[PDB]
Every structure is written in C-alpha cells, then in structure tokens.
Amino acid sequence: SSLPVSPYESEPWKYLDSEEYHNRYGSRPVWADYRRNHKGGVPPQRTRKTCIRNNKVAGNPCPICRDHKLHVDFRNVKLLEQFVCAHTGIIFHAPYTGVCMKQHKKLTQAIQKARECGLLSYYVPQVEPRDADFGTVHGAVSVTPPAPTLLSGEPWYPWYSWQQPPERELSRLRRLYQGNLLEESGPPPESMPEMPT
Amino acid sequence: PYPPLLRAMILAERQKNGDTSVQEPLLNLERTRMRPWDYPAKQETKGRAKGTPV
Amino acid sequence: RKKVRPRLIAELARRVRALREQRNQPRDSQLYALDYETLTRPHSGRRLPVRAW
Amino acid sequence: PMKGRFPIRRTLQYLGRGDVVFKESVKIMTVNYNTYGELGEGARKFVFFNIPQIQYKNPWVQIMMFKNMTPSPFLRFYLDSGEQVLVDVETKSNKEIMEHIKKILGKKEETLREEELEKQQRFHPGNFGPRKYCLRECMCEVEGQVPCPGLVPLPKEMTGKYKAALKAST
Amino acid sequence: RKTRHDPPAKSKVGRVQTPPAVDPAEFFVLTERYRQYRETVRALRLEFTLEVRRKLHEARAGVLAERKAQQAIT
Amino acid sequence: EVKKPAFMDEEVQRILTKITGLDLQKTFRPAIQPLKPPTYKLMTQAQLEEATRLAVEAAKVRLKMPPVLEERKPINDVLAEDKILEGTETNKYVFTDISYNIPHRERFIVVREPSGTLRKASWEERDRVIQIYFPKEGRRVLPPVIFKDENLKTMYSQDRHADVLNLCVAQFEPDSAEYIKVHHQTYEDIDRHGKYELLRSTRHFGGMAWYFVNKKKIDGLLIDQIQRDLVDDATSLVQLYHMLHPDGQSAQEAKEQAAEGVDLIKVFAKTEAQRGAYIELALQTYQEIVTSHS
Amino acid sequence: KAYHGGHLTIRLALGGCTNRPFYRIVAAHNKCPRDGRFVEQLGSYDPLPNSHGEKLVALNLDRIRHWIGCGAHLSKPMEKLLGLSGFFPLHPMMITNAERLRRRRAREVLLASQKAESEAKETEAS
RNA sequence: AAAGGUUUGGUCCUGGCCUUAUAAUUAAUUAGAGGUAAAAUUACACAUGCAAACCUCCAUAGACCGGUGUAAAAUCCCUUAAACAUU
Ligand code: FES
Ligand SMILES: [K+]
Ligand SMILES: [K+]
Ligand SMILES: [Mg+2]
Ligand SMILES: [Mg+2]
Ligand SMILES: [Mg+2]
Ligand SMILES: [Mg+2]
Ligand SMILES: [Zn+2]
C-alpha cells in the first residue's frame, strides 16, 4: 500500500531535463519501447481502463504508469508534446501509444489546458470578420424614440392596471353567481410587497 | 399602440428605408371587433345529437 | 399490384348503416326530454350542469 | 483493374464534372451519330464521353441515340413549348459540341446559384434536433448552458426527487 | 386514453361538477382584460395576414418577376 | 475641413500594403493540420510563372487587413417598463430574433429583467447569443482564457504575436473593447522589443503601423526598416505620418523644403522624432554601407 | 398518422433529460404528438438559467409572423413567452396572477407585523 | 483487413473453413453507492382497479394521445385534381 514518491511532484518539467531521463529514454518518446500483450494480430480497440488499482500495478504497465516520475501536468509541455502529432497536431488515440484509458483522458485534458493557456502551440486558422458591414445606426443597436406612455409613466395598455369595476356590474355578478361567491377584492398593492424575511 | 417590441421593429424599418417621421405606429381595431361571448350563434351550422340510446 | 380485391361487405355495411339512421331518426321530443326529478335526459342519460338546475 | 475502356467515366467525380444543366424547357435530346466516318469523330466522342455527364445533371431529360441513320451527325432538342432545336455537330469537336449546347440551352451560373440557396432556406444553425438535420440535439451541448444530467450530475436542489422529499418534510 | 366504445368507470359515476366560486371584482376585471387583449391580438393577426399576402403577390407578379419572365423569352 | 485619412482610404491601403511586404514562403507557410498526399504537375517556365502569379494573387487576398474601428458605444435603451411584472420572475429572459436573413448588427435582442423593464441586450449579451444560434467557426460562446494578461505574456515570450491577433479576430468583434485591448497590447509589446519582423508579410502589419502613426511613435519602426535595408518602406511610413498629421511641424517642414526620398526621413528626425538622434545614425550608417560597398 | 380535422398550432415541444427540461418552439398540426411530427421549428426555449443567470429564448420572428398570418393558433405558454418578449401584449392571466401574488405577499407581510406585535406583547410581559 | 492458422514426403498454385475486431440477447460465476439512458418471449387466454371529459341545458370532444407489427412486395419519389370531420 506504499506507492513510490516522486521527487519531481512540485516541478514535473524538471524530470524530463535530468540525466536520469536521458539515460532511460534518450531522445525517443517515452512510449517508443512499449508493446501491448494481446491475443490475435488485431488488438482491442481500447486499451486497459487503468494500470494502477488501489496501489497495485498491472502486469505490463503503460508508458506513463510504468515510470512514476513522469507526471501528466499541463505545465510539463515537453512530455505532452510526445503525445501530439508534430505534423497534424492531432492527439494520438490511446492504442497508438499504449497508454491506459485513465492516463489518456488525463493527458487529453492536460494538452487541452496547456493549449488554452498558451503553453503549448497549435495552429490558429485565419478567419474573416463576422459581419460584412460594421454600422451601428440601426434601431436594434441604437436608441428607439421613447413611447408616449413610457415618458408619462403610464402602463403600456390601460387594462394592464386595475380599473375598479362599476358598482352596478359588481351587483350583476353577485346575482348571476349567487350562492357560489368569494369575498370581493379591492385594488391590489401599488408595488410588489417586499418579501418577509 | 403596438406592442413594445413590435413598435421598435416598425420604427427601425422606417429609419432603414429612409422614411423620416415621428408618427406613432397605431393598430386599427375597427376591422376586428369581437361580438359578446353570449351572442346568438348560427343554429343552421350546429350539430344534432345521434339517435342511439345509451 | 393487382392483388388488392374488393370489399363488398364493407360497401354493404356502410350503405345499410346510413339507411337505418335516416329511417329511425329521433325527434326533438325524445332527444330533449327531461326527468325533472333527476335533471337527467333519459334518451342519453346526460345530467345537466349544476348552474342550469 | 476496373473493366471497360476509360473506366474514369464510371466515377461520381467525372459524372459531376458536367457543366451543361438544361433549361426547364428541354425535354428530349436525340443524338444522331455515325459509327464509321471521318467527319463524325467528334460526335462519336461526344456520345462516349459527354452523354453520361449530361444525363447525370439532367435526369428527367430523355436522351435517345440513333446510329447510322443519316449521312451526318446532328443533335435535335425537343422543348416543352413544342419547338425543335436542330444542331449540326459535323466537323465539330466534342468540347465544341458541349459549349454550343451550353450556350443555347444551358442554364447560366447565376440561375443555378440562386436555386442552391433557395434549397437550403429551411436549414437553420440555431435549430436543435437530430444530427441528420441539425448541428446540436440539445441546449446542454451549448457552452454555459446547464449540462446534460447524464454526463454531469445536477445539484440536489434542482432534482424532483429532492424537491418531493422537502414537501413531505414541510 | 379511452375510446368512445369503452365502458365508464364505476368509481366516478357519483361525480358531479363543482363550479369554481367567483370573485365579483376580480372576475369582471379579468373579463375585460380578455376582451381587450383578444381585440389587440386580432388586429395583429390581421396585420400579419396582410404581409403574407403582400409578400406572396410581389413574388408572383412583382416588378422583378415580370421583367425576368420577358428577359428569358427575349 | 480636410478629411482625416481613414484606414480603408485607397491611398492608405497602398502605403500600408507596401510597407507590409509580401513573401510567398511566409504567407503560405505550411499549416500544422491533417495532411493529404501532395500532387505533382509538369510545367514549363511560362506555366510555372503563371502559377507563381496566381500564388501572388492569392497571397493578396490572404493578406487583406482586418478592420480598424473605434470602440462601440454601450447600448442603454429601455423599450418598456412594465412594473406589473415586478417580483413575478427571478431570472432574466433574453429573447433573440433568429430570422436567417438579418444582419447580426440589425437583429433585435431584448432582455426582460425581473423588475419588468424590457431593454435592449448589451453588446456583450448580443455577441454571446449570436454565437449560440449562428455559431462561427473559430469563435467560442464564452471568452477564452488565453486573452488574460498572464496568458498573453506567455504567447509573447514564444514570439506568437500573429497568433494572439488571429485569435483576437476569430473571437472578438473589431469594434469591441476586448478586441482593441488585445491589439493595442500586442502592438505595444512588438514596439518595446523591436519585433516588427514577426508581423511582416501578414495581414496584421497594417494595423500595427496605423496604431503607431496615430500614437506618434513610428521611431522604432523607422529604425528597424532602415537597418533591414528597407528604406523605401521607411520613406512611405514618413509619408503616411505626414498625411495623418498635416499640421505637424514635420509635415510643414517637408513642404517648405520639398523633401523627397531619404530627405523625408531626415526631416522627421529633426522635427518630430521622439528618438531623432538614432534615426539619423541608422540612416547615416545605411548610406555609408551602400556608398562604401556600392 | 393520417389526421382528419385539426389546425396548425405553435407550441413548445419538450426535450432534454430528467430534471433538465428544454423546449423547441415548433409549428405543428394540433393532433400530432407533443414531441412528434412538426411542420417548422420556430425557435427554442431553455427554461434553466445559464451561467450568467439568463433564461434564453430564441424566436424566429419572421416565420412566426408567417404562420400566425396563415391561421396558426398559439398555446398559452407560447402566448406568455411572446408577451415577455414584447412581441405580443401581456396575457390577461399574466397580469391577474401578478396581482394575486401581490395580494398574497401583502397578507404575509401584515401577518409578520402582527406576529412581531404579538412578540412585542411577549416582550412587554418579559 | 496491414492480416493470420489449417491440404503435402516436400514445393508451388487454387480453394474452403476457422482466428483476431465490434455490438445485442440469454446463461454460468461475481458484484458498493451515485447520475443518466433503455426496458422487449409470445396478435395466446385474462381476475381486479384505473386510462375522456367538459359545460347554464344545445353542442364540442371521446376519430386524438397511447399500443402492437396483424396483413401485404407490400413501397419510395413525383404529377394532376378535388376536397376536410378543419384553422
Ligand atoms: S441530451 Fe441535453 S439534457 Fe440530456
Ligand atoms: K487460406
Ligand atoms: K491438397
Ligand atoms: Mg356556450
Ligand atoms: Mg439475465
Ligand atoms: Mg403514436
Ligand atoms: Mg406478419
Ligand atoms: Zn497506465
């Protein structure tokens, strides 16, 4: 239950410049000398879900998992570049490098975060401006003349406000619905009452 | 008056087309006035119940 | 196609049914009869709404 | 190896290279050509190379070809008005024949572009629906909008299961 | 949902209508709002009905429509 | 009043294009994208020269400069104030007209606030919703995080100024404050570090020189153009400076002496140059090298 | 299905997942299923506030005007949406419900003051 | 398919079978919780409950929604015409 502790956890980029990295890997990618063990000639379309379960390591740990000092961080661009095509800039699928699905998702997120912060370069296409015309004189983006009701402060339509019914009409309804009536309601509050708290 | 958004779309189109005016768009309600709900309806076009007893 | 075949029974049924409706048309005295004790129409059993009682 | 001579004629790219799109008046195009001779070489090449391209862009036009019925090759178009347009293609290259018929009875580039835009009037990018018809199936796909509960669990307070429990507690 | 040929339930034979009670002041105010609202919406539906027919006629027999027809024949 | 020259003036576009330059190898540098097998054609010297001409025609369309506009003015217009709806809603409604054939700057996008006010959507709200319903390739609904000063400084360290600007054109509108902010930050970084070569043979060179002329700091660009043996460009830059600042002491001095060619640059050094002493030294050194060698 | 009778209507078609509702504004024959065959999609409504706290409605106001001009009815939720936008007048029940909510909060505020006054009597008792 | 194994004393050719990839159902063994999607042996027989009302009487609706894949090479696409139990 004791996984080894890497000295480069704080600064992962340091490992890839150290002599220890050069001796083990040289100038080749960290996945160059890895082969997957599988039945048949056509391999499964996904790699194993994960190489490490509860501090235990699988039989043939993947390039990332086999070396604990290797750290998948958006800041460790030199490691991330090994998992991106230099010519097309497409991130390799997991079977290509043989990394487990857990580390591939972690690598993809680190690559995407590195690109968004500008640490890792990518190709920016040249795109034309959205609009052919850049005028701002249409009413939609300009000032509409204020409506007469808006200047006076009245409701847009008169029936928006409560207009007291005539007394004769209130009696006409009390006769029509005699025996099934509710208490008469007066004018509603002028504004919304502040919520009690 | 016209509804608030539909009024602004009318005034905006005026300015775009070069029509300069401060006239307020107005809806005409005379052509489309509704009868009361209890107004007698057309009996000739009304249905009759069927002759199968329940 | 040409394997679609006539449906005589359906043709006979439609006409016969329509004829019976014309022969046995009900009258207003029957369709709109009412039992005032229950306020329900005997022809159809429809109970009138409460606001009409 | 694809069978036949010039198997490129049996590719969708070649069939789509045709540029002669007839006007709606054109209904029939009869091709009278001779299989032997020297002045009818362009006509024979036109039947070999160009007739497939013309039919591909004009599926509703009847192209019927007759062989060795007359001394010289010609094209006769039958229009919907009842007019008959005779073309004489003797001593004319297959490329020349295509350009001639394009000029007299071919739709212009402007007309074809207008039809394409009108065809796509009812596709809107903002519209949501299946991938076959729309870019996005649901608003959860849009950035900043509430994500799909399947991918990302919703907050408990936004769930009917939780809301029902509180109402019982009340 | 049931068809007209289905038998009615035996738990709802007793059912009778309970009409809602009516507030005189609010019922009248609401009845007037519906009449005035529905008149405004009928005026707008007519304005929209006219733009549809105007746009249709311009396309069918507008200035541009007539010129293109003759231009093609020429 | 003599009209102030504009960015799109045919005279300004001529001068800005010339100083920008062209380089078919830089303009058509290979893109890091999914690749296809190359094609091959056997061509004579005439055919090859024709193909090179078409390449220069395409490089012109590729180098079309993006618009330089003034900052838009905040939209603050209230269509209505329906107070009956106060307190009946907790969240704002944003309504967008998505009729296909309306220009985006002529669409009506309104907001119904919880207080009941019906107002027009602000510029930031307009751009967000137009991306949600008319999505543009390259643009994201929410502003990316690369445009933060710390992130932008990283791109500048990597000499990726043409990328910072290509991203600023894909995401922001030319008249937006964010667009103007990033451009003026990139142009200022190029000046301080003398990295004018990064934007040559690119569509972003014109806006950079335009910005320097208006801000009266063409000294660095002249010193760099002279040291690269591009002294016809330096003269054209001094002409553009004498065109947008006609009443400047330098422009009036060149009329008095009818200066032309290298004379124009010498006039600028004495009259209005912030660092005139260096412009003469670099200009003199260029003359010595040209005269001594040839 | 082969419908007989009915009219075109503009209504909201429910999409999304559980606890994540999303609506498509569509023009459809009234007898069709809620999420089934439609004639045209006229916009969308997302009833859940987004990151900016904004409920997003999209209206194809050119096509909406076309279908109202051809007899298309409107569902009551869609009549409410057009009223909030400003394209239609506020619906009668939108105003009535806002008045009922005002009268209902006035009672609550008054009761709280009465309770506070009753609590004040408790304070007087000490 | 980027292929592989397998006829012979041996080699080459021809040719089939099978392996490796992907998915659904069932079964054996095994298994924590959470979010989401889906739910399906059978047009065989069905206990019981519910699934269509509304409404000042007339009418309107129950012709929909929902279900199954019965029948039929049954269809697609397109043209013309006229209607609707409609708006
Ligand atoms: S698919 Fe959009 S909420 Fe689930
Ligand atoms: K074999
Ligand atoms: K053998
Ligand atoms: Mg009635
Ligand atoms: Mg099972
Ligand atoms: Mg169904
Ligand atoms: Mg069968
Ligand atoms: Zn691993």
Numbering used by the authors:
A (entry chain O): 42 to 238
B (entry chain 0): 165 to 218
C (entry chain 0): 3 to 55
D (entry chain T): 2 to 171
E (entry chain U): 27 to 100
F (entry chain R): 63 to 356
G (entry chain M): 10 to 135
From the paper:
Mitoribosomes are essential for the synthesis and maintenance of bioenergetic proteins. Here we use cryo-electron microscopy to determine a series of the small mitoribosomal subunit (SSU) intermediates in complex with auxiliary factors, revealing a sequential assembly mechanism. In this study, we determined sequential cryo-electron microscopy (cryo-EM) structures of stable assembly intermediates and initiation complexes at 2.8–3.2 Å resolution that involve six factors: RBFA, TFB1M, METTL15, mtIF3, mS37 and mtIF2. In conclusion, the model for the SSU progression through the assembly pathway includes a sequence of binding factors as an integrated network, with RBFA serving as a regulator through its allosteric control mechanism, which was not reported in a bacterial counterpart.
Comparison of our pre-SSU-1 and pre-SSU-2 (3.1 Å resolution) structures shows that TFB1M is missing in the latter, whereas rRNA is more ordered. In addition, the N-terminal helix of mS38 is inserted into the rRNA groove, adopting its mostly mature conformation. The association of RBFA leads to a vertical displacement of uS7m in the head by approximately 12 Å up, and the entire head is rotated approximately 10° towards the A site, compared to the mature SSU, thereby exposing the P site region. Thus, RBFA prepares pre-SSU-2 for a subsequent accommodation of the next assembly factor, and also prevents a premature association of mRNA and mS37.
